[PDB]
Design a protein around this ligand. Structure first.
Ligand SMILES: Nc1ncnc2c1ncn2[C@@H]1O[C@H](COP(=O)(O)OP(=O)(O)NP(=O)(O)O)[C@@H](O)[C@H]1O
Ligand SMILES: Nc1ncnc2c1ncn2[C@@H]1O[C@H](COP(=O)(O)OP(=O)(O)O)[C@@H](O)[C@H]1O
Ligand SMILES: [Mg+2]
Ligand SMILES: [Zn+2]
Ligand SMILES: [Zn+2]
Ligand SMILES: [Zn+2]
Length: 646
């Protein structure tokens, strides 16, 4: 059995720490109870000639340890000392060094405020001093990342809430998101515009060394240009990162699988599922048995694939966006290793119903029978699967809220009420479909969504201060294209409605640098309000929300901006609750399901749960609510269809 890659045990820490010990300050110390698992395997089974440790035979003194039944190093396939093992290597613009000299080289570079590349378990990290403004602004520049929040590694978990200290210290050692008030030492460029900071603890022996001598918080971000795959080779780090890193702290141990840090909320909610959780299987729900091997390709962004067989499913690591170049290489390598570990050969492939997805291209190359699942049906079934809803459990009403996914018959959906079970998805209602002006540009420029909402729903909209930067431009050319349907497809998107509201409040840059940026901003603004009495509503008209009444009330309710943002969240939840109540009660349904990337918004769930207390409510928890949980939803729908004999 291979278990997930795991955080250094207290025991290995104690040995690396004790003077005169053979592995004192050795940065590759591992044992039978911690260390790289999944990341160091070239093939099955889990024995040293088929790990990366074949470049290192074991010296005489690491032969009574590995061979020893009493030792906590009995069949640690990667275990080595400084005599026989990998050793650190420092590389700089006309410098070089090795071992202890290399570790000190990096420490000194970090201390002087520089960016260093450090080889971790699952890839490389870029690090600097997280207190040092100059250094953060520069890392942002070089990595191209102008706003997306940086995770930060802390020496200890002192001063954090109990719930976070608990998660931070698990063998998985994820990044945990916590209120930024708890970490005053961070410069303001770490998570600008947001209320949460992602923190982590040292989880690998090198990280423990670095932090023990640095005793300050460090940025720890992925070793790559934004929207390019993490370099995994020393060779590729040194090439890809030359203009970013001031220095390289590398090593001659190969990494064989890309494995990003996992990200959870202090609440326990899973956001990104990789290091520490993969490659654990999950049990399929009651009634799911004897399922043939099916490969589920997942979503185009935040991608994971899934392998379904028998009574279990296994999700891959976060692979990211599949429109990136070199992501297919890492994808296929992860699939190769996962199929080899599970002796898995697919007989079927399942993929998204969207014909323009990269994933749907790869499927047709496979020579297996293929089938299609609606994006929003997959989101909803993924949530039902996590809650172990039985195969014959009965219909639910689902609310699936996201940016965009392809719906029935070509429609663009992202804010829908559905009747679902594992085989069927019937669309019932939701947000009105509104144009995306300039197609792909609508997700980058929130003001385009505000314009589209105003043209549809707001009389004399040019007279509101909220619309002033749009009204001052020559907006009629784009309005003429909208009316003619030129690159302005209709979408009932919850994510785009969030962007319209954020444009109206001015809480985001006019043009965004990352996906979901305006919505995270608006949520951060609203979360600073403790709740407010307000008159803004989103009433139900038949099976849709009445956005004209929404805009007229919301635009005319002057209040501090945090209260305006809170009112929007509240009125949105109240209107969807009203819709789901009518649909579920008149069908005899007592369970409601919530899914889609928007359902990561904590204030939205809090308000939905406040207004839907008359129902049983199923929210995602152990898998991401967004696209990273999508392959699992595809796999349970495929399975249930087969189990029914269709
Ligand atoms: N305050 C925060 N709020 C939400 N998410 C956070 C926060 N801090 C860190 N994270 C997550 O930590 C992750 C690390 O890097 P990410 O930067 O997306 O992928 P990468 O492959 O490592 N590099 P890149 O491709 O540029 O993104 C991102 O998912 C962040 O969203
Ligand atoms: N806190 C939030 N509040 C509202 N919307 C959000 C929030 N976080 C993310 N989103 C939205 O959800 C989208 C991600 O949803 P997901 O289902 O993962 O992907 P997609 O929309 O690409 O199918 C983001 O682009 C953004 O539109
Ligand atoms: Mg503190
Ligand atoms: Zn150990
Ligand atoms: Zn040795
Ligand atoms: Zn989605």
């Amino acid at each position: 059995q291979i278990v997930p890659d795991a955080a250094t045990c207290p025991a290995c820490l104690a040995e690396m720490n004790t003077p005169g010990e053979r592995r004192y300050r050795y940065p590759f110390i591992n044992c039978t109870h911690c260390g790289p698992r999944f990341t160091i395997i070239r093939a099955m089974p889990y024995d040293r000639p088929f790990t990366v440790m074949a470049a290192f035979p074991l010296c005489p003194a690491c032969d009574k340890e590995y061979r020893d039944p009493l030792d906590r190093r009995f069949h640690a396939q990667p275990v080595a000392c400084p005599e026989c093992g990998p050793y650190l290597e420092w590389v700089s613009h006309g410098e070089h060094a090795e071992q202890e000299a290399a570790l000190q080289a990096a420490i000194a570079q970090l201390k002087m405020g520089n960016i260093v590349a450090i080889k971790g378990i699952g890839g490389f990290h870029l690090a600097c001093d997280a207190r040092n403004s100059n250094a953060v602004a520069t890392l942002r520049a070089r990595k191209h990342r102008p706003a997306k929040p940086l995770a930060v590694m802390l020496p200890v978990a002192d001063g954090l809430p109990d719930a976070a200290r608990q998660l931070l210290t698990t063998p998985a050692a994820p990044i945990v998101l916590v209120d930024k008030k708890y970490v005053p030492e961070l410069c303001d460029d770490i998570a600008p515009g947001l209320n949460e900071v992602g923190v982590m603890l040292p989880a690998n022996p090198l990280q423990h060394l670095l932090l023990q001598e640095l005793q300050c918080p460090l940025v720890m971000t992925s070793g790559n240009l934004s929207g390019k795959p993490p370099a995994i080779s020393n060779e590729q780090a040194l090439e890809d990162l030359q203009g970013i890193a001031d220095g390289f702290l590398i090593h001659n141990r190969d990494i064989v699988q890309r494995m990003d840090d996992s990200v959870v909320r202090e609440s326990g909610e899973m956001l990104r599922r990789s290091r520490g959780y993969v490659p654990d299987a999950l049990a399929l729900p009651p009634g799911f048995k004897n399922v043939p091997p099916v490969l589920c390709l997942g979503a185009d962004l935040k991608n994971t694939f899934c392998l379904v067989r028998g009574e279990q499913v296994v999700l891959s690591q976060h692979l990211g966006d599949l429109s990136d170049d070199g992501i297919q290489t890492q994808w296929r390598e992860a699939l190769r290793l996962m199929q080899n570990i599970y002796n898995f050969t697919p007989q079927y492939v399942v993929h998204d119903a969207h014909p323009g997805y990269v994933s749907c291209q790869w499927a047709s190359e496979m020579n297996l029978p293929t089938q299609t699942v609606l994006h929003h049906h997959a989101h909803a079934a993924a949530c039902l699967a996590e809650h172990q809803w039985p195969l014959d459990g009965g219909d639910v009403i689902a609310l699936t809220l996201d940016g965009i996914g392809m719906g029935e018959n070509g429609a663009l959906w992202g804010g829908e009420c559905l009747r679902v079970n594992y085989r069927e998805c019937e669309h019932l209602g939701g947000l009105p479909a509104v144009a995306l002006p300039g197609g792909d540009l609508a997700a980058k420029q929130p003001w385009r969504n505000l314009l589209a909402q105003c043209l549809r729903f707001v009389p004399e909209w040019q007279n509101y201060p909220e619309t002033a930067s749009v009204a001052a431009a020559n907006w009629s050319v784009l309005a003429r294209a909208i009316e003619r349907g030129i690159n302005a497809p209709l979408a009932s998107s919850c994510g785009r409605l969030f962007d319209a509201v954020a444009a109206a409040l001015g809480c985001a840059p006019a043009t965004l640098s990352y996906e979901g940026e305006a919505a995270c901003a608006l949520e951060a603004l609203a979360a600073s309000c403790d709740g407010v009495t307000h008159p803004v509503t989103m009433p139900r008209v038949d099976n849709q929300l009445d956005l004209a009444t929404f805009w007229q009330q919301w635009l005319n309710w002057q209040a501090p901006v945090n209260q305006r943002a809170w009112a929007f969240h509240d009125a949105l939840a109240q209107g969807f609750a009203a819709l789901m109540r009518e649909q579920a009660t008149m069908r005899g349904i007592t369970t409601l399901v919530f899914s889609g990337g928007v359902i990561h918004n904590r204030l939205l769930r809090a308000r939905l749960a406040h207004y839907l207390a008359d129902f049983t409510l199923l929210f995602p928890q152990s898998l991401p609510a967004g696209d990273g949980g999508l392959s699992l939803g595809q796999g349970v729908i495929a399975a249930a269809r087969w189990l029914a004999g269709e």
